[PDB]
Amino acid sequence: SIWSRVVQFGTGWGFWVSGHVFITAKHVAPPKGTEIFGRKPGDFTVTSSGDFLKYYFTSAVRPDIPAMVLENGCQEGVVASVLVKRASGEMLALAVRMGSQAAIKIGSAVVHGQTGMLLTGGTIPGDAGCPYVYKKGNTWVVIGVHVAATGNTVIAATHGEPTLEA
């Protein structure tokens, strides 16, 4: 069901956080100016940080879904899931122990994101944009989008202002 929020997008995948909010890896997204989901620029606004790309649509695109919480990464040691879809429609929930912050070259330049360790009981380059999620008690929470793999290590791009200020 949460899997219906994961859809193909550009050269990778993206994730519906809510009916109005779509997130993806910037490096797989269609060019700025492209019509998406039958919507023209103007009907949506685009924000980016590093390899994190976020679309906000004025009118809901997926009215069938509730808003999920979007956090800026998670605590170290948290075991999250990478919701990997393949073009065949296959669904692979990859367990990942979230780690600390690293950088990596992605195309033109260097982005920064939260590393993670793929747990065995991996990813391929067309998996970029798939969501990292975890259950916080009763609530599913999205913490970022898949950017790249390494040798066991994955990187997630993150985004979001924490509710509480210092």
Numbering used by the authors: 4 to 124, 133 to 161, 164 to 179
Paper quotes:
We made three constructs, NS6 1′, NS6 2′ and NS6 4′, which were extended by 1, 2 and 4 residues respectively, generating proteases that contain substrates that correspond to P4–P1′, P4-P2′ and P4-P4′ of the NS6–NS7 cleavage junction. MNV NS6 4′ crystallised in space group C2 but in a unit cell that is very different from the C2 crystals obtained with MNV NS6 1′ and that has only one molecule in the asymmetric unit. The electron density was sufficient to build a model that starts at residue 4 and ends at residue 179. Although the extended C-terminus of NS6 once again reaches between loops bII-cII and eII-fII of its near neighbour, the relation between the two molecules does not involve two-fold or quasi two-fold symmetry. However, no specific contacts are made by the C-terminal peptide with the substrate binding site.
Whereas ORF2, ORF3 and ORF4 each encode single proteins, ORF1 codes for a large polyprotein (∼190 kDa) that is processed by the virally-encoded protease at five specific sites to release the six ‘mature’ non-structural proteins (NS1/2–NS7)—and an array of functional precursors—that are required for virus replication. The viral NS6 protease present within the C-terminal half of the polyprotein performs all the processing, including its own autocatalytic release from the precursor. Norovirus NS6 is a cysteine protease with a chymotrypsin-like fold: two β-barrel domains separated by a cleft that contains a Cys-His-Asp/Glu catalytic triad similar in arrangement to the Ser-His-Asp triad characteristic of serine proteases. To this end we extended an inactive MNV NS6 construct (which incorporates a C139A mutation to knock out the active site nucleophile) by adding residues from NS7, which is immediately downstream in the polyprotein.
